[PDB]
Amino acid sequence: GWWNASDIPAFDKSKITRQLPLIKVEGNRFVDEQGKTIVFRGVNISDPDKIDKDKRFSKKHFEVIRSWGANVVRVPVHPRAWKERGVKGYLELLDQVVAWNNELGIYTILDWHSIGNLKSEMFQNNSYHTTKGETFDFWRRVSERYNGINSVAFYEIFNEPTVFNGRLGIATWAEWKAINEEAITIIQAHNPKAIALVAGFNWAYDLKEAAANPIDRQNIAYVSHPYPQKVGAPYQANWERDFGFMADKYPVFATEIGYQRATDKGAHIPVIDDGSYGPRITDYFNSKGISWVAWVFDPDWSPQLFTDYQTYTPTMQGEHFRKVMLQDNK
Numbered sequence: 182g183w184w185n186a187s188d189i190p191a192f193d194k195s196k197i198t199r200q201l202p203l204i205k206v207e208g209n210r211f212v213d214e215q216g217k218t219i220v221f222r223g224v225n226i227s228d229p230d231k232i233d234k235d236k237r238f239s240k241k242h243f244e245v246i247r248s249w250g251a252n253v254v255r256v257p258v259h260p261r262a263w264k265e266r267g268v269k270g271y272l273e274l275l276d277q278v279v280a281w282n283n284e285l286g287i288y289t290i291l292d293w294h295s296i297g298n299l300k301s302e303m304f305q306n307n308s309y310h311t312t313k314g315e316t317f318d319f320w321r322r323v324s325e326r327y328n329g330i331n332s333v334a335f336y337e338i339f340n341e342p343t344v345f346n347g348r349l350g351i352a353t354w355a356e357w358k359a360i361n362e363e364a365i366t367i368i369q370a371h372n373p374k375a376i377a378l379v380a381g382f383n384w385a386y387d388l389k390e391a392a393a394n395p396i397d398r399q400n401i402a403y404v405s406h407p408y409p410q411k412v413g414a415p416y417q418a419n420w421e422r423d424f425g426f427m428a429d430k431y432p433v434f435a436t437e438i439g440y441q442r443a444t445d446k447g448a449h450i451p452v453i454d455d456g457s458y459g460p461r462i463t464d465y466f467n468s469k470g471i472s473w474v475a476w477v478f479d480p481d482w483s484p485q486l487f488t489d490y491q492t493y494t495p496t497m498q499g500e501h502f503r504k505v506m507l508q509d510n511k
Contacts, residue, residue: 183318186268192326196280201288201332203374206400210470211376211432221288221472222463222506223253224486225437227479228294229274230262237490238274243281245493246478250507254282255436255474257294257340260311263319272326283332290436290474291323291333296341296384300360301350305343313360320364324371337378337436338364341385341406354381354390358397365398378434380404386411388424388433395431402432409440409458410451416458417465428469438462439476439484440498447483459501467509475502 202213210218224246232238246254256278263271275291282289295311297304304310316339327333338361344352365377379396381387385406405424412419427433440454466473475498480489486499495503 182264183268183315189269189272189322192276192279192330196276197283197330199284200330201283201286201334203331204288204334204376205374206376206402206432209428209430209432211402211472218470219252219511220470220509221253221434221474222502222510223251223255223287223474224249224478224502225255225257225292225474225476226278227477227482228257228259228262229278230259230266230271231479231482233274235490238277240281240284243278243285243287247285247287249495249503250510251287252506252510253288253290253335253472253474254278254478255290255292255335255337257292258319259294259308260315261308263315268322272322275323276326279327279330279333283330288332288334290335290337290378290434291327292337292340292436293319294340296343298342298344298349298352299339300352300356303349305341305345305349317364317367321367321371324368324375328372331374334374334376335378335402335434336368336372336375337380337404339380340436342380342382343384344382352382354394357382358391358394361396362398365396365401369398369400375400377401378404378436380406383411385436386423388427389422392427392430402434403427404434404436406437407435407462408438408451409454409462416461417468420462420465421469425465425469425471428471433469433471435462435466435471435473437476438473439486441484441496445483445496446485447481449483452484456497459498463502463505463509475499 295309487493
């Protein structure tokens with residue numbers, strides 16, 4: 182696969198005609214280069230490999246995102262699509278997403294979208310399977326190719342670390358910290374402005390162990406994926422204990438949030454909720470200045486933000502997150 186690729190052309194610079202403001206981390210916030218705080222609220226697209234097989238891979242899908250008010254889009258690269266298109270075929274799609282977002286004024290998070298315990302090579306299922314060699318190779322190639330484009334601002338090293346109570350083996354936070362430090366050294370040696378987003382365990386929900394022993398690099402932020410059934414009621418005090426307290430010292434990006442009713446298409450734990458989670462969590466994130474990205478701007482993967490590609494009509498969570506982005510993004 183990745184170890185057999187070559188003759189990969191460089192990013193075509195004529196696809197881009199403007200530079201967005203450079204974002205950096207200062208203490209617990211993201212800031213632009215006048216020092217103004219920016220909070221990002223946007224959406225995950227489905228994998229570009231899926232949008233292309235649906236024949237919807239065109240700038241007009243991303244213009245609909247811009248009309249919902251998003252100021253960031255997260256792109257979940259699944260290791261299985263990266264192997265099946267191959268490095269050169271997948272970078273053809275990824276370079277077009279980066280150029281479309283850039284021309285629309287929207288920042289990109291590149292997400293290596295695997296779930297499980299990368300150190301022992303045990304994953305939630307065979308679709309997320311990858312290795313440390315392939316993961317570091319992916320980060321080396323994208324940090325080198327998008328270096329210099331300020332709109333590719335965030336590199337989310339590995340979507341959802343989890344050992345599932347031991348079913349996926351053993352990984353301490355100390356060992357996971359050393360792997361993310363090495364991934365961050367690779368990215369910052371190619372792209373000195375990159376901000377890396379690092380996650381903890383329990384499917385990227387917990388930041389308590391990270392706070393006790395933080396990553397030893399600069400320009401980084403921490404992730405949480407506080408879906409509605411990760412914890413029960415008093416929700417805000419449980420969220421604050423598990424990850425929101427970290428937002429007093431480092432920026433926290435909740436790179437997946439989302440919810441739908443028990444009877445909705447593909448509904449599964451932990452995304453099931455009656456509807457009060459949406460206002461409760463975006464108010465909680467406004468109280469703490471936490472950035473977030475809703476999952477997922479697709480009509481098939483669950484929970485859906487819209488019902489079909491003919492109309493892009495928002496679902497129940499889609500209507501709430503779109504209203505909050507149009508109102509609160511600055």
